[PDB]
Amino acid sequence: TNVSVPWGATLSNAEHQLIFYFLVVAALAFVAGFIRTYITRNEVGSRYRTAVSARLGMLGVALLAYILIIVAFLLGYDSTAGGWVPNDGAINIFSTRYIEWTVSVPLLTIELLAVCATLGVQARRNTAIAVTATGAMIFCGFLGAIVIDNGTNTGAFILWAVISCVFWVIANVVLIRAVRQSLPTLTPESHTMLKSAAIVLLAGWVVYPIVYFLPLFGASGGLTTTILITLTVADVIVKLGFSTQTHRVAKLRTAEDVRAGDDVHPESIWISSVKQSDAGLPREVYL
Amino acid sequence: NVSVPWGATLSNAEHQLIFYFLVVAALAFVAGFIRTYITRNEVGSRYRTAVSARLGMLGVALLAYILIIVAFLLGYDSTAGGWVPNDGAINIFSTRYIEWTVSVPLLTIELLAVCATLGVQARRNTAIAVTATGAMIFCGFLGAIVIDNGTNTGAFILWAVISCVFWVIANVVLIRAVRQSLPTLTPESHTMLKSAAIVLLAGWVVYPIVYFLPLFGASGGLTTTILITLTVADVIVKLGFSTQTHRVAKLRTAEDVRAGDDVHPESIWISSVKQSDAGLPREVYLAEGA
Amino acid sequence: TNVSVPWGATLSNAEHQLIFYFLVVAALAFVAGFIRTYITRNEVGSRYRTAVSARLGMLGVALLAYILIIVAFLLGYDSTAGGWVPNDGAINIFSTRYIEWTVSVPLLTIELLAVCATLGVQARRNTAIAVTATGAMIFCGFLGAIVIDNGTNTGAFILWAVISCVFWVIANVVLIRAVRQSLPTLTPESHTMLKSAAIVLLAGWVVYPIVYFLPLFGASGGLTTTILITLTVADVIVKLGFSTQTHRVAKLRTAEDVRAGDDVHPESIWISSVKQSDAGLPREVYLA
Amino acid sequence: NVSVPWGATLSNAEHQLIFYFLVVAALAFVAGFIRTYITRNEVGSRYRTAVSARLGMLGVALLAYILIIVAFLLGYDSTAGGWVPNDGAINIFSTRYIEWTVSVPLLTIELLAVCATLGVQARRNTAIAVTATGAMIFCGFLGAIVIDNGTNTGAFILWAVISCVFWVIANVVLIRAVRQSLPTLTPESHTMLKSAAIVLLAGWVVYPIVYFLPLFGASGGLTTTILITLTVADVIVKLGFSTQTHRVAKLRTAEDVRAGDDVHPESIWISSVKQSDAGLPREVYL
Amino acid sequence: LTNVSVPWGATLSNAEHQLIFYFLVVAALAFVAGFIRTYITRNEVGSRYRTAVSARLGMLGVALLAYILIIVAFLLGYDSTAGGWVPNDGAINIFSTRYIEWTVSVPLLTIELLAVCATLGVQARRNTAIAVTATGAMIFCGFLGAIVIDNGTNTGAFILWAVISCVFWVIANVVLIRAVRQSLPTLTPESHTMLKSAAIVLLAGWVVYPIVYFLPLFGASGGLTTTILITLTVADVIVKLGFSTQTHRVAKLRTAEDVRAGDDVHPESIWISSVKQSDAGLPREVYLA
Numbered sequence A: 001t002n003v004s005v006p007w008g009a010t011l012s013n014a015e016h017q018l019i020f021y022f023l024v025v026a027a028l029a030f031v032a033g034f035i036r037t038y039i040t041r042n043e044v045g046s047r048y049r050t051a052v053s054a055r056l057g058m059l060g061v062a063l064l065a066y067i068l069i070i071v072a073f074l075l076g077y078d079s080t081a082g083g084w085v086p087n088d089g090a091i092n093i094f095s096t097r098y099i100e101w102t103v104s105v106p107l108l109t110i111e112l113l114a115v116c117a118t119l120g121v122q123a124r125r126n127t128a129i130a131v132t133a134t135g136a137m138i139f140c141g142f143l144g145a146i147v148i149d150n151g152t153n154t155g156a157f158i159l160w161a162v163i164s165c166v167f168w169v170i171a172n173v174v175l176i177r178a179v180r181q182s183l184p185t186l187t188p189e190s191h192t193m194l195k196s197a198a199i200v201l202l203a204g205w206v207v208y209p210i211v212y213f214l215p216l217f218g219a220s221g222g223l224t225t226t227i228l229i230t231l232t233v234a235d236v237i238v239k240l241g242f243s244t245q246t247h248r249v250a251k252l253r254t255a256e257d258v259r260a261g262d263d264v265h266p267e268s269i270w271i272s273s274v275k276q277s278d279a280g281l282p283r284e285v286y287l
Numbered sequence B: 001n002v003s004v005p006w007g008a009t010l011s012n013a014e015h016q017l018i019f020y021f022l023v024v025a026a027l028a029f030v031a032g033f034i035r036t037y038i039t040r041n042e043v044g045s046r047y048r049t050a051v052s053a054r055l056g057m058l059g060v061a062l063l064a065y066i067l068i069i070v071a072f073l074l075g076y077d078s079t080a081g082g083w084v085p086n087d088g089a090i091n092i093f094s095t096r097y098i099e100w101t102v103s104v105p106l107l108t109i110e111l112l113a114v115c116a117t118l119g120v121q122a123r124r125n126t127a128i129a130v131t132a133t134g135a136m137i138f139c140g141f142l143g144a145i146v147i148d149n150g151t152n153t154g155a156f157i158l159w160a161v162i163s164c165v166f167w168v169i170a171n172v173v174l175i176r177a178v179r180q181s182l183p184t185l186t187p188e189s190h191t192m193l194k195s196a197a198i199v200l201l202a203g204w205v206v207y208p209i210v211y212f213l214p215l216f217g218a219s220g221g222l223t224t225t226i227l228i229t230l231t232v233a234d235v236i237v238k239l240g241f242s243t244q245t246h247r248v249a250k251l252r253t254a255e256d257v258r259a260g261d262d263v264h265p266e267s268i269w270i271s272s273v274k275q276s277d278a279g280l281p282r283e284v285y286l287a288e289g290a
Numbered sequence C: 001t002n003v004s005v006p007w008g009a010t011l012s013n014a015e016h017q018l019i020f021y022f023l024v025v026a027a028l029a030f031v032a033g034f035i036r037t038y039i040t041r042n043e044v045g046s047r048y049r050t051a052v053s054a055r056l057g058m059l060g061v062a063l064l065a066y067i068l069i070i071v072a073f074l075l076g077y078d079s080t081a082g083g084w085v086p087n088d089g090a091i092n093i094f095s096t097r098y099i100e101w102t103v104s105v106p107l108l109t110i111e112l113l114a115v116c117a118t119l120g121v122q123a124r125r126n127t128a129i130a131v132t133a134t135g136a137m138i139f140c141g142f143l144g145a146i147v148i149d150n151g152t153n154t155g156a157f158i159l160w161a162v163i164s165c166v167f168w169v170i171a172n173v174v175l176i177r178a179v180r181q182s183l184p185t186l187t188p189e190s191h192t193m194l195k196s197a198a199i200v201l202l203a204g205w206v207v208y209p210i211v212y213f214l215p216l217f218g219a220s221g222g223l224t225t226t227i228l229i230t231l232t233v234a235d236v237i238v239k240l241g242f243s244t245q246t247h248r249v250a251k252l253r254t255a256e257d258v259r260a261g262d263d264v265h266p267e268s269i270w271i272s273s274v275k276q277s278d279a280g281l282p283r284e285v286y287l288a
Numbered sequence D: 001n002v003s004v005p006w007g008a009t010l011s012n013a014e015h016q017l018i019f020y021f022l023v024v025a026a027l028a029f030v031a032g033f034i035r036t037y038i039t040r041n042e043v044g045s046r047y048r049t050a051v052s053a054r055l056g057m058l059g060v061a062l063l064a065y066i067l068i069i070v071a072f073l074l075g076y077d078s079t080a081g082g083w084v085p086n087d088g089a090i091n092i093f094s095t096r097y098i099e100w101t102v103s104v105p106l107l108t109i110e111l112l113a114v115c116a117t118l119g120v121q122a123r124r125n126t127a128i129a130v131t132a133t134g135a136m137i138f139c140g141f142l143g144a145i146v147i148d149n150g151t152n153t154g155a156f157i158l159w160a161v162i163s164c165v166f167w168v169i170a171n172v173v174l175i176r177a178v179r180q181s182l183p184t185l186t187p188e189s190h191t192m193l194k195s196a197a198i199v200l201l202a203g204w205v206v207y208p209i210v211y212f213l214p215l216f217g218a219s220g221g222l223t224t225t226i227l228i229t230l231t232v233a234d235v236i237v238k239l240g241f242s243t244q245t246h247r248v249a250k251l252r253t254a255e256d257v258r259a260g261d262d263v264h265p266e267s268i269w270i271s272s273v274k275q276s277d278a279g280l281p282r283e284v285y286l
Numbered sequence E: 001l002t003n004v005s006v007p008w009g010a011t012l013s014n015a016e017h018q019l020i021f022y023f024l025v026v027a028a029l030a031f032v033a034g035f036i037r038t039y040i041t042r043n044e045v046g047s048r049y050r051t052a053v054s055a056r057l058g059m060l061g062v063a064l065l066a067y068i069l070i071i072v073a074f075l076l077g078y079d080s081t082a083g084g085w086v087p088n089d090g091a092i093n094i095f096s097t098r099y100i101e102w103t104v105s106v107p108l109l110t111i112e113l114l115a116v117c118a119t120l121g122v123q124a125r126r127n128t129a130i131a132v133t134a135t136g137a138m139i140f141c142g143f144l145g146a147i148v149i150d151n152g153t154n155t156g157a158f159i160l161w162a163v164i165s166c167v168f169w170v171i172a173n174v175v176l177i178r179a180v181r182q183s184l185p186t187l188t189p190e191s192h193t194m195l196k197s198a199a200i201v202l203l204a205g206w207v208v209y210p211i212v213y214f215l216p217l218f219g220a221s222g223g224l225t226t227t228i229l230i231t232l233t234v235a236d237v238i239v240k241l242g243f244s245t246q247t248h249r250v251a252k253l254r255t256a257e258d259v260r261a262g263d264d265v266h267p268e269s270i271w272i273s274s275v276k277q278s279d280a281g282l283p284r285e286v287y288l289a
């Protein structure tokens, strides 16, 4: 064995206060995000609405997931005057985060594929692979770090992390391919944003496998604090960073369709205070 | 005697797996509910019953699963690498029946809504399908839970059979109503409705099979299997089926627009392929007003 | 006889499981109903919107009320070797249901009067009487069965049940009159629906006074279970049954107004997959 | 010297009555909130402040009453002697002040919104009415609750008077603003605004009266009366008044449509009598 | 030395405990009323100035929820005794939770002001990024000083990080003031006035917080602790609701102007204090291939 489970380390008051701070700040950030996303939903044509429903879906999940993580944290440690001593439920703080990823991540794939130019079967096939891939990716990490021998077995810990990375690559490929195919068919302005969005998501993803392995280099209140806070900052930045990008895309693509006279939008579309499309109504129709 | 699944002690691995799938399910339903709500106006007023049913069922499922999760947390007491069932452990199974009682009937309504059945033939079908599926569940509940704390092997098997009676009645009514619609629909609609019907009616089989596993003994592993399988079943069927009936309603809505039977204020898309164009109703005067 | 309070009877596990089942199934049924009602709100012209706001209002109340009933139930009984033994809070299970009716019923009256053709003072007067009548009707039953001598006094129990029935009749009259007056001025199709809706509500109402008196024929876990479950089935059927009807009415009346060119509706109106009206916009207007 | 009402032990009959009215109130507000939300677009953009205020106040009232109910359930312990007050029994009365503090000012705004007040005269009135009613409540809170656990008969009466000062200031500001509007309104609008104003300003009297009952002694019966009366008062005033200001906004909206001052995308009705017809704005080119 | 007297160490009278709760809950309810008003009046503003609305609703939602936590922390923070209300371990959380609130609520306040400002392209996106991270850091610093470091007893860190905080504070004030002073020229007289007003309410009020931060240095007392808690609550409510109402009035004026200038169209008439600003208009109907 080399695995020092992070829910074994006792926390100082400073650490316990910092973790809670970032946890709740995260939850509230997601509430603010969810609200913003909901209110700005009709800034996007019916064609790119899957991007919106996915974004709102994932923010809703993240929000609720983080409430559980917060609850688990509050019931996971006991104050002893010698610090905060982990109880049996301390593992749930890490357990709950996997639950989050299991649902939140697949929605992130769907959101990216939605702003991609994939059509018909090529689109539905990609989604199916990306979803099941990312789903499996998380579920594997869960088996290694949590489920199997209370996450103490160094064999399984490393084994399933690798099995996970297999699925990870499958995902990266499917997404990168689907993006690389779209960029040509898009305008210069759209091209740039989709590339940006794809990077923010696929780039950030790297942080997680790195943090997964830190428990191998030992155990400590400081390490455990780092693991918890990093993943929180990671979750917030990726989810809100990426989401904002795919939105800006959907709007650009919507505005383009309006300008190209492919469709009409009942309100004017703006980006950084620069008008993109004008408000228009459909023709009145006789039966 | 019947080996009740809420008698079996769970390992930490098992307790962790059950919770994982339970909460993942609940959150999947949150995501589904939100998606369904946001995409509600992609469907004509004619097929709105399909939407209200889908949102209704996802809302119920969501809340039901919160109860199941709570029951699970209060159903077992930790014992140094093991979780020992308490008196409330039965409620984990009890609560799932409560879910089905409401969630399933809504699934029937949702399918019949996208079907072409018209007038009283339609309203009669719904009435039978609903009461049938309602009774189907309530029966299984009496057998597995209510009667002699679900230990009586007689009642357990008896009411499971009475249940299966109602089950068939439902399958018939639905299959008939679908087989009648498919002819009068287009090729593209025809395919989807058939698909949706299969996902629902096919998946249904899993449940009676899982109901009887308690007869082949009791074990942490079995109990875990029963709980997880039903969760995966619930999620796949409800979200799998729901997505299908939606794609139908949109196709049927787009068709009505193209056929010039109605108008829709936004363009309708499926897999990024345009189906209908946005149109407004003609501006009209009044024969008499203020 | 003599009054055997139903919150005195000990429940078997089978009974305790059945009550909870129906209670929660009810609550969820109301969630589904509330959602459906909300989504289908704009299927009705501004003229008949009072019908919708009332229906959604009552479903919202019912939903929340039943959450309280469920809470009361969970805190009302303690598990023992002898089954589920009533504690002091067991009375609240019955107490809470009265609270529900007090609000949910008056909304049911308003909902029916909304789809009625009553105009001006005749309309506002009817509502005022029906509401206060049904309100008093419930509050009376509450005094008899719960408030007065912890609902053990057989005198008050029967007395106030009668005072209640007085208000009950006043309501039935006001509603029946208001309906019978509308039916003439309505179309054949509307006429039929309003009659149907009125029956479902006014007919079902009978179940409640009947169940009120069962505590006189003794007390048992079986009886208590019957009282609780019957009232739940009653609540669900009446509220959802009736509600669906008044909706079908409002839509028909809305579609008619559109066809008669009296008003316009921005979407096509359907009933059992049969189109009733077509989508229309108002004429664009130039301002002085 | 003052017989605090949270000192009195309650019978079962009393405890059951209080809870009944408390929850019935909360549910009445749920029904009201829902109605208000659904009927929000029956009013022109001009009188929307009336709607946002009404929905705001119903939302507050609803939540406030949930707290009052919770406080009630945690305020008394069942014994051989009935329901005996614990330390938290005061919170039942405490929580109601919290409600008024927010719910009342919104009631002022709602009335001023359907008034014809324009520019500074409007913004000034609101500012005074809000701070006036806010202070009015906060004063009563100091007297009855905060100062010496509301036992000091001096402060109890003192701050009740300071309160009444603010009370009058409010009545004046509102009455003035209404009396100025009634001339510029139609006969039908004139009547409604007067009605609404009475329901609010009239009902207000009940509260100061109930505030002083604790001086004529303490008793389960009195405490029950105080609690139930305030509940009936809250419900009647809030949704009685609210229904009126709504009927006003619709009339004023319909009038603007008929006068060709504005357009409304749906037909407006009152007691089944059509007021305005549905109309769209003219299409605009650029 | 340890001259910092933690406010969560002071025992509270019944009068004080009652006052704190009163203002806490009144605040929460004020935010509920605000959130509702904001949501209902969302479509009084053109798509161009929607970021102003989403930010305001976002911040009111956060404030609302944050205050629920503060209230819960308060109820679990003190135990009633013969000697009044005695602080327990969790009493610090009452102050801890308020920092959490500010961390999110404040940055949204910056975004809301920048949204009604005329900043365009990168100059706009850059300003927001600085203002957000600046205000974020500003709060997080105060948190380290008053709470995290040596349970907020270390007078060194307390004063040190308060200064580091004030650095970020100024950076924010500058970015916002600059962005406002640049907009005022390109705006009308009526808009100019409102934006200036809104900016004052926010930037002016901000001063109260650093002042209250340092009161723990003058000693400790139930009365002081009560003052700290109540003041911050009144501050939060006034700033958030005061400022928010103003930025709204701006967005509407700017929306109405665009309509009158024939730059855009709005489907309903826009009013301010019962004075019409724009008339309802529809976009031209369009036929497609």
Ligand SMILES: *C/C=C(C)/C=C/C=C(C)/C=C/C1=C(C)CCCC1(C)C
Pocket (backbone or CB within 6 Å): A101, A104, A105, A108, A137, A138, A140, A141, A142, A161, A164, A165, A168, A205, A206, A208, A209, A212, A234, A235, A238, A239
């Ligand atoms: C918003 C939440 C996000 C983006 C979470 C992402 C998580 C991962 C990309 C996790 C990947 C992992 C591996 C590829 C190996 C080790 C185990 C995981 C699950 C951490």
Ligand SMILES: *C/C=C(C)/C=C/C=C(C)/C=C/C1=C(C)CCCC1(C)C
Pocket (backbone or CB within 6 Å): B100, B103, B104, B107, B136, B137, B140, B141, B160, B163, B164, B167, B204, B205, B207, B208, B211, B233, B234, B237, B238
């Ligand atoms: C989303 C939830 C669904 C589709 C649940 C379905 C449940 C059934 C089809 C249950 C059927 C049963 C029988 C026919 C026999 C044994 C008892 C039941 C209730 C499991």
Ligand SMILES: *C/C=C(C)/C=C/C=C(C)/C=C/C1=C(C)CCCC1(C)C
Pocket (backbone or CB within 6 Å): C101, C104, C105, C108, C137, C138, C141, C142, C161, C164, C165, C168, C205, C206, C208, C209, C212, C234, C235, C238, C239
């Ligand atoms: C949805 C809930 C409904 C329709 C409840 C109805 C309740 C009644 C009609 C009750 C009537 C009663 C009497 C006329 C006499 C006995 C006491 C009552 C309250 C049960």
Ligand SMILES: *C/C=C(C)/C=C/C=C(C)/C=C/C1=C(C)CCCC1(C)C
Pocket (backbone or CB within 6 Å): D100, D103, D104, D136, D137, D139, D140, D141, D160, D163, D164, D167, D204, D205, D207, D208, D211, D233, D234, D237, D238
């Ligand atoms: C919906 C709630 C309402 C209208 C509450 C109104 C409360 C008052 C008008 C209270 C006034 C008081 C005085 C003028 C003197 C005594 C103390 C008060 C606060 C009861």
Ligand SMILES: *C/C=C(C)/C=C/C=C(C)/C=C/C1=C(C)CCCC1(C)C
Pocket (backbone or CB within 6 Å): E102, E105, E106, E109, E138, E139, E142, E143, E162, E165, E166, E169, E206, E207, E209, E210, E213, E236, E239, E240
């Ligand atoms: C609605 C909430 C608001 C506006 C909160 C504002 C808080 C501040 C401006 C805090 C500033 C501080 C300093 C500049 C120094 C001391 C520490 C702080 C965080 C109180």
Ligand SMILES: CCCCCCCC/C=C/CCCCCCCC(=O)O
Pocket (backbone or CB within 6 Å): D063, D067, D070, D071, D074, D088, D091, D094, D095, E017, E018, E021, E025, E028, E029, E068, E071, E072
């Ligand atoms: C809208 C804010 C809700 C806050 C969450 C509180 C959850 C439930 C608690 C209710 C409070 C109990 C009754 C009042 C006690 C106040 C004690 C005091 O006087 O300080």
